Amino acid sequence: GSHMVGQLSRGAIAAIMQKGDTNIKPILQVINIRPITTGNSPPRYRLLMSDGLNTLSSFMLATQLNPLVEEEQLSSNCVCQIHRFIVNTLKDGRRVVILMELEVLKSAEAVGVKIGNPVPYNE
Numbered sequence: 001g002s003h004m005v006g007q008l009s010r011g012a013i014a015a016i017m018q019k020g021d022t023n024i025k026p027i028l029q030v031i032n033i034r035p036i037t038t039g040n041s042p043p044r045y046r047l048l049m050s051d052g053l054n055t056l057s058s059f060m061l062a063t064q065l066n067p068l069v070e071e072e073q074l075s076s077n078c079v080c081q082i083h084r085f086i087v088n089t090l091k092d093g094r095r096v097v098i099l100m101e102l103e104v105l106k107s108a109e110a111v112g113v114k115i116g117n118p119v120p121y122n123e
Contacts, residue, residue, distance in 0.1 A: 016087065029050045029080070031076060044063065
């Protein structure tokens with residue numbers, strides 16, 4: 001409906017990367033998904049996600065959720081609630097947000113556009 005940016009958890013990305021709270025179950029929009037180069041092992045998917053204010057490209061899907069991308073519709077423009085995630089920190093200091101459980105609330109086709117005008121979060 002109206003006020004589309006009100007559908008997203010504005011401020012959740014800052015909360016995740018500044019406060020590190022994991023109890024939140026934020027609603028985010030998928031902007032893009034791409035495979036990352038891997039083994040030797042199951043494919044891995046990286047996501048550019050938006051909370052309406054910011055985008056962040058450091059999300060990775062847990063491999064158990066790969067069928068959502070391959071088979072169902074987790075795809076660009078869909079709106080999703082993150083039910084479980086963890087943050088992992090690399091040796092170099094970068095952080096990765098691993099999505100463990102998520103629910104598609106609205107399909108890509110039902111949303112159809114990038115909501116709002118989010119800007120990149122500066123890690």
